[PDB]
Design a protein around this ligand. Structure first.
Ligand SMILES: O=P(O)(O)O[C@H]1[C@H](OP(=O)(O)O)[C@@H](OP(=O)(O)O)[C@H](OP(=O)(O)O)[C@@H](OP(=O)(O)O)[C@H]1OP(=O)(O)O
Length: 290
């Protein structure tokens, strides 16, 4: 059958021509969903590789209309899960956000649907990453060009040490290796957030390896967890682990007592404004201080 034929012969190596022929497949017949569904999947993958995310989004909306009746729920959810899993490794924050929101809207009332919950969790974590990124941006600064920290070490983003070598080229090489392109010492906000998320995952693992921090960290909500991560960024794991009384009160959710006790530390006396914001976060469990 020629819908079959169009789809199959279409897969080729002039992506613009291949994509236009896929458009041909939706145009040619389309309505029976299986072949139009596969064509749209292909086009979404091809635009994701071609880095044209607007077109990818528009063709993803097309695909969703197929799942209500044109394609079996098992198969459609398989396809959407695949799309999720090969876009989970993208620095593209806004694309991920829009994708997640559209998926959530589309699957809201889908009978016996299990993907809405996975995407909703992913969007929650995305919002959380955005908030922690902004928090640390406010407390430590964001810099999109390579610079020297107070030790003279090449750094970028939010305190992301690139190297202790005095060679600027060595720093650029480490940066290119970590970002995956010839950046010439300059990066986007999104690339800065990728490095920062890596640094966050690191700090989280460290917190979990610390026998004094793991209890309090587990006990806390996501926002207060960010406050604790903030302290770890500022002082390191064992430095934070010295707040024995405050850590215990925190683990007990004695928010006001914990805040009062944290305000009497040397940390507060030394960096009052940052400590003030962090303690507000510990107390209220909100981002209001940021
Ligand atoms: O099996 P192939 O002919 O080698 O091509 C496959 C196949 O697509 P087609 O059947 O349309 O050719 C899969 O799609 P389905 O059969 O499951 O519908 C698709 O899997 P996805 O569900 O993830 O789209 C897969 O992609 P991948 O191998 O990365 O999982 C894609 O491979 P190519 O697009 O590279 O040809």
């Amino acid at each position: 059958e020629n819908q079959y034929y169009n789809s199959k012969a279409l897969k080729e190596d002039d992506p613009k021509a291949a994509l236009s022929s896929f458009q041909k497949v939706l145009e040619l017949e389309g309505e029976k969903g299986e072949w139009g569904f596969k064509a749209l999947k292909q086009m979404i993958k091809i635009n994701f590789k071609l880095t044209n995310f607007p077109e990818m989004m528009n063709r993803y909306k097309q695909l969703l209309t197929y799942i209500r009746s044109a394609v079996t729920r098992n198969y459609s959810e398989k396809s959407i899960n695949s799309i999720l899993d090969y876009i989970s490794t993208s620095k593209q924050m806004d694309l991920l956000q829009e994708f997640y929101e559209t998926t959530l809207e589309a699957l809201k009332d889908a009978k016996n649907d299990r993907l809405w919950f996975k995407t909703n969790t992913k969007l929650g974590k995305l919002y959380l990453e955005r908030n922690i990124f902004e928090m640390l941006r406010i407390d430590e600064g964001l810099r999109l060009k390579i610079y020297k920290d107070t030790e003279g070490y090449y750094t970028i983003g939010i305190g992301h040490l690139l190297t202790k070598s005095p060679s600027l080229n060595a720093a650029k090489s480490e940066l290119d290796k970590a970002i995956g392109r010839n950046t010439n010492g300059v990066i986007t906000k999104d690339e800065a957030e990728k490095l920062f998320n890596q640094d966050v995952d690191a700090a989280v693992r460290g917190i979990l390896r610390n026998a004094k921090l793991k209890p309090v960290y587990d006990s806390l909500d996501a926002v207060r967890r960010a406050a604790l991560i903030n302290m770890v960024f500022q002082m390191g794991e064992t430095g934070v682990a010295g707040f024995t009384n405050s850590l215990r009160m925190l683990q007990q959710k004695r928010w006001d007592e914990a805040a009062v006790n944290l305000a009497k530390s040397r940390w507060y006396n030394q960096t009052p404004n940052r400590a003030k914001r962090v303690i507000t976060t510990f107390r209220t469990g909100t981002w209001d201080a940021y």
